[PDB]
């Protein structure tokens, strides 16, 4: 039930599917800071430099491991959790 644990790019702008990064902080979590990607446009930026609604900006999600102060605020004990973070965006053709 419990285990002992020891301790050890301008892509967002340049993208065809650009994204905004929103800082997410919790001092009670490790990592304490995660930046999350939110797709700027619904479509995609083309050669001309405008939103092509033929394509779509989609965020690329990832199930990440995080630690949390369990009991709440207890600074020595932790619980392992799995959160779904969006790292960036890609441009896809519909299905």
């Amino acid at each position, epitope marked *: 039930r419990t285990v002992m644990v020891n301790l050890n790019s301008d892509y967002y702008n340049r993208s065809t599917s650009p994204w905004n990064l929103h*800082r997410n*902080e919790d001092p009670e979590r*490790y*990592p304490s800071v995660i930046w999350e990607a939110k797709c700027r446009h619904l479509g995609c930026i083309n050669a001309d430099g405008n939103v092509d609604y033929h394509m779509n900006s989609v965020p690329i999600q990832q199930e990440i491991l995080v630690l949390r102060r369990e009991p709440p605020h207890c600074p020595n004990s932790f619980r392992l959790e799995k959160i779904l973070v969006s790292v960036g965006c890609t441009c896809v053709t519909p299905i």
Partner: antibody
Amino acid sequence: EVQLVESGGDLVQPGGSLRLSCAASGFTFSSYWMSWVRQAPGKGLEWVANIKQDGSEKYYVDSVKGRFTISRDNAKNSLYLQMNSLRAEDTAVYYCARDRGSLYYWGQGTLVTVSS
Amino acid sequence: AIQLTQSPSSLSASVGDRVTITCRPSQGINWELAWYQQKPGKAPKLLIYDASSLEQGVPSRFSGSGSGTDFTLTISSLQPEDFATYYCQQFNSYPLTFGGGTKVEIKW
């Protein structure tokens, strides 16, 4: 861009009062925690107060516990600092910042002067 | 509270040098430490979080390290645009505290 703009800071005699005002913009002000850190003339940083998303929890440094009052108006996009019985030690630049533990988003600061 | 002892309080250095600032908390902390840079007339910039993690935008020439009672901020190759006061701050428990700062001054 996220924007934090302080105001209210002015010369006020000791014992007096003043209300700081941090004007937030560029984010869902209602979803994030806020803070106030001070810098006394030629001195280091000193964490002062922080307030929860809604306004249910609030934490302080003991040098301002009972004297200072932190508040928020999530509809207005404003963080406040109602300070009272102002001392010499209370003359600093008051910066407001977003989040609680590691502050990335900082305001420019507001000088509160308290003297004779 | 958890008192942060910063070492040294001031230091002279030249462009290209390797600056090593140390932060030592009064008690024991896991990773709950942050580093900042402050230049005259500006609000502090956050450099490193969780004692070792580089923040968004912060250049590669910055390292953060250590655990428990020994924390290290390191500028491998000093730049002119790097002379400032550096603060360390714990977020282990309230009241949140700052170190006294370290002046990375110019050695004439």
